[PDB]
Amino acid sequence: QNTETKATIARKGEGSVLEQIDQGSILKLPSNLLFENATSDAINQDMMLYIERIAKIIQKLPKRVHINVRGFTDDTPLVKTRFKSHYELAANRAYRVMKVLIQYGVNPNQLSFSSYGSTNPIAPNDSLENRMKNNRVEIFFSTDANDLSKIHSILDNEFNPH
Amino acid sequence: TETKATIARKGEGSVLEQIDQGSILKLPSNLLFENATSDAINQDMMLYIERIAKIIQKLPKRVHINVRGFTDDTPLVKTRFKSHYELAANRAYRVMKVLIQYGVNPNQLSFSSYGSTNPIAPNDSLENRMKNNRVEIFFSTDANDLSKIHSILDNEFNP
């Protein structure tokens, strides 16, 4: 039923999970592992060491892997912050992690960053734990394989009478 | 996710279908074989097989081709075939054999049988029953990049 396994990043690394989907892998990191709070892009004192470890793991992965850093927020009112929107907050957070991965030697041609804003929650925002997961950063690992597409195009050009 | 098909302007009926893990080329059995109980290929449609063979030869080794056989559910009584599974196996295999005749690498080919199990139509008519009698060719790859990515991540991260 489940395709998520807890992941251990730093011999502590609490709350992180690895999910497999059919078109790739998603590493999910709760807010408090990267940032001082849910509402800023300011990094916390352990941020760097976590990302270094992820970057080492990434170095074992083949070259054609594309790595997408994805940001997410909860619905926390944005009045107290310098951001215009949830999308903007999540973009800046995703972008910072990407940049740190670059500093650690991950090739920029394999990296991008995304923002989902507040509308893909993992859980109810009824606890600190759940709030940290709703403000998570994700890392999606995939490829731009097109073998199946070339087969289809090939077959289509030969065998379509339309 | 499908359209009609032909070749050299002599082969209506055959459809190409795309599914997420590969492509399926449909060859109507009725055209393909002399009659509804034989594994003897229509010697007139060896030219459609050849075309398919020509395309396969363009595809790299990671692309595997599976020739699949399917039947209606008319009980077999006047025949030397002992089941629909066996009948479907022989038809798939005979089409496979002809691809091989036309130069296709035997190591990229296999044949399957589904018997009467997954009919395109309800079995009630030389209209409908003959829709169930078919041979499909499934094109896919042995790609495991995503599986390998997951394995490595899981090995490094999962306690």
**DSSP conformation class of A53:** H
Q: Are strands B134-141 and B109-113 parallel, antiparallel or unpaired?
A: unpaired
User: Residue B135, SS3?
Assistant: strand
Contacts of A148 (CB under 8 A, 6+ apart): B20, B21, B22, B23, B140, B141
Mutation choice for A interface testing from B141, B153, B158 by most A CBs within 10 A? B153
Query: For the domain with range B1-159, which CATH number is right: 3.40.50.1820, 1.10.10.10, 3.30.1330.60, 3.40.50.1220?
Result: 3.30.1330.60
C-beta of residue B91 within 8 angstroms of C-beta of residue B135: yes
Domain boundaries, chain A: 1-162
Half-sphere exposure of B16 (CA within 13 A, CB side): 21
Smallest Cβ–Cβ distance between A147 and the set B141, B158, B159 belongs to: B141
Mutation choice for A interface testing from B14, B24, B156, B158 by most A CBs within 10 A? B156
Tell me how the structure was determined.
Answer: X-ray
Query: Which tokens go with A35?
Result: 């940032």
A155 to B7: CB separation less than 8 angstroms, yes or no: no
C-beta of residue A94 within 8 angstroms of C-beta of residue A137: yes
If DSSP states are collapsed to H, E and C, what string results for A5-22? EECCCCCCCCCCEEEEEC
- What is the radius of gyration, based on Cα positions, of chain A? 18
Query: Which tokens go with B110?
Result: 């296999």
Q: How does DSSP assign A54-71, residue by residue? A: HHHHHHHS-TT-EEEEEE
**DSSP-assigned beta bridge partners for residue B66:** B110, B138
Q: Note the resolution in Å, 1 decimal.
A: 2.1
- Burial label for A64, CB within 10 Å (0-12, 13-18, 19+), is exposed
Half-sphere exposure of A154 (CA within 13 A, CB side): 21
C-alpha torsion sign, points A112, A117, A119, A123: positive
**A161 touching B (Cβ < 8 Å):** yes
Q: For the structural domain made of A1-162, what CATH number should be given? A: 3.30.1330.60
Strands (E) located in chain A: 4-6, 17-21, 24-29, 66-71, 111-115, 137-142
